[PDB]
Amino acid sequence: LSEEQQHIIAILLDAHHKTYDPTYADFRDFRPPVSPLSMLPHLADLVSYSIQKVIGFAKMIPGFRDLTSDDQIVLLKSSAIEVIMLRSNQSFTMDDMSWDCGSQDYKYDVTDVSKAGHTLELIEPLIKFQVGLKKLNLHEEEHVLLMAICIVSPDRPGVQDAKLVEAIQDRLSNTLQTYIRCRHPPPGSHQLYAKMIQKLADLRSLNEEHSKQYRSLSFQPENSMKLTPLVLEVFGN
Amino acid sequence: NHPMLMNLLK
Numbered sequence: 001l002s003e004e005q006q007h008i009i010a011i012l013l014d015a016h017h018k019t020y021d022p023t024y025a026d027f028r029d030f031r032p033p034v035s036p037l038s039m040l041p042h043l044a045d046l047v048s049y050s051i052q053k054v055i056g057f058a059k060m061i062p063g064f065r066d067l068t069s070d071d072q073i074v075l076l077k078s079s080a081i082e083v084i085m086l087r088s089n090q091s092f093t094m095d096d097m098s099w100d101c102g103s104q105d106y107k108y109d110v111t112d113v114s115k116a117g118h119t120l121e122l123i124e125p126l127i128k129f130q131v132g133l134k135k136l137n138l139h140e141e142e143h144v145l146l147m148a149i150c151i152v153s154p155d156r157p158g159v160q161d162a163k164l165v166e167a168i169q170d171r172l173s174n175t176l177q178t179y180i181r182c183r184h185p186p187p188g189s190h191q192l193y194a195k196m197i198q199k200l201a202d203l204r205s206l207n208e209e210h211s212k213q214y215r216s217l218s219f220q221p222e223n224s225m226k227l228t229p230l231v232l233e234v235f236g237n
Numbered sequence: 238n239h240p241m242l243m244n245l246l247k
């Protein structure tokens with residue numbers, strides 16, 4: 001762990017602390033939770049809010065601001081839903097397979113999230129993905145590095161300067177690998193890097209299944225009507 | 238073609 005690597009980690013920890021609230025206070029300011037589409041307005045509000053927080057986190061990733069605004073846009077567009085699913089793991093509880101932002105009012109289980117016009121083809125893998133990530137028992141240092149590596153990914157469509165994105169990502173990857181060796185207890189560290197990258201692969205797949213269902217959902221104007229302007233700009237019209 | 242993303246970036 002160089003000085004540079006320690007800086008990267010500390011910056012990403014504070015960025016996350018500044019941009020994620022598992023008390024979910026602002027969820028009062030959403031359309032309230034409540035057909036198999038009753039939760040769409042509330043959960044479209046939650047996703048829309050959460051995208052703003054991902055952009056907050058993203059801007060504090062070292063080297064991110066050195067990218068063009070074009071590259072920044074496309075990285076956020078493709079990563080947003082993944083980072084939202086990924087960061088939600090901290091509020092996920094295997095006690096009853098729910099995301100429990102403190103209060104019953106803002107406690108979301110399989111029944112809640114199943115009522116926003118997405119089918120279990122998306123929901124079941126999303127819940128299994130949370131269970132899998134809980135089972136890795138990641139350090140928050142590994143959590144926030146995985147979020148940054150998720151965002152700054154040179155294999156995302158529309159990337160102009162892939163070499164610069166790859167450079168940022170390698171520095172993040174090296175930092176994560178070095179952290180796991182120097183700081184993650186063996187045998188927990190065994191192929192942990194590899195299990196983490198697999199989790200990124202599970203996010204890409206959840207991403208494309210979210211895309212397909214959103215493409216469908218959104219082609220119905222009574223549904224697009226319940227979305228937000230930001231959700232329409234990011235996921236498409 | 239992403240004015241709201243552009244605004245939240247800046």
Ligand SMILES: C[C@H](CCC(=O)O)[C@H]1CC[C@H]2[C@@H]3CC[C@@H]4C[C@H](CC(C)(C)O)CC[C@]4(C)[C@H]3CC[C@]12C
Nearest residue numbers: 043044047084085088091099108113116118214231
């Ligand atoms: C409650 C929880 C976060 C808690 C936390 O931040 O701590 C979040 C994280 C991931 C979210 C799901 C992502 C995939 C879906 C996207 C569509 C968005 C739409 C525009 C309609 O496509 C809404 C319904 C779905 C199932 C979301 C439900 C809420 C979930 C489970």
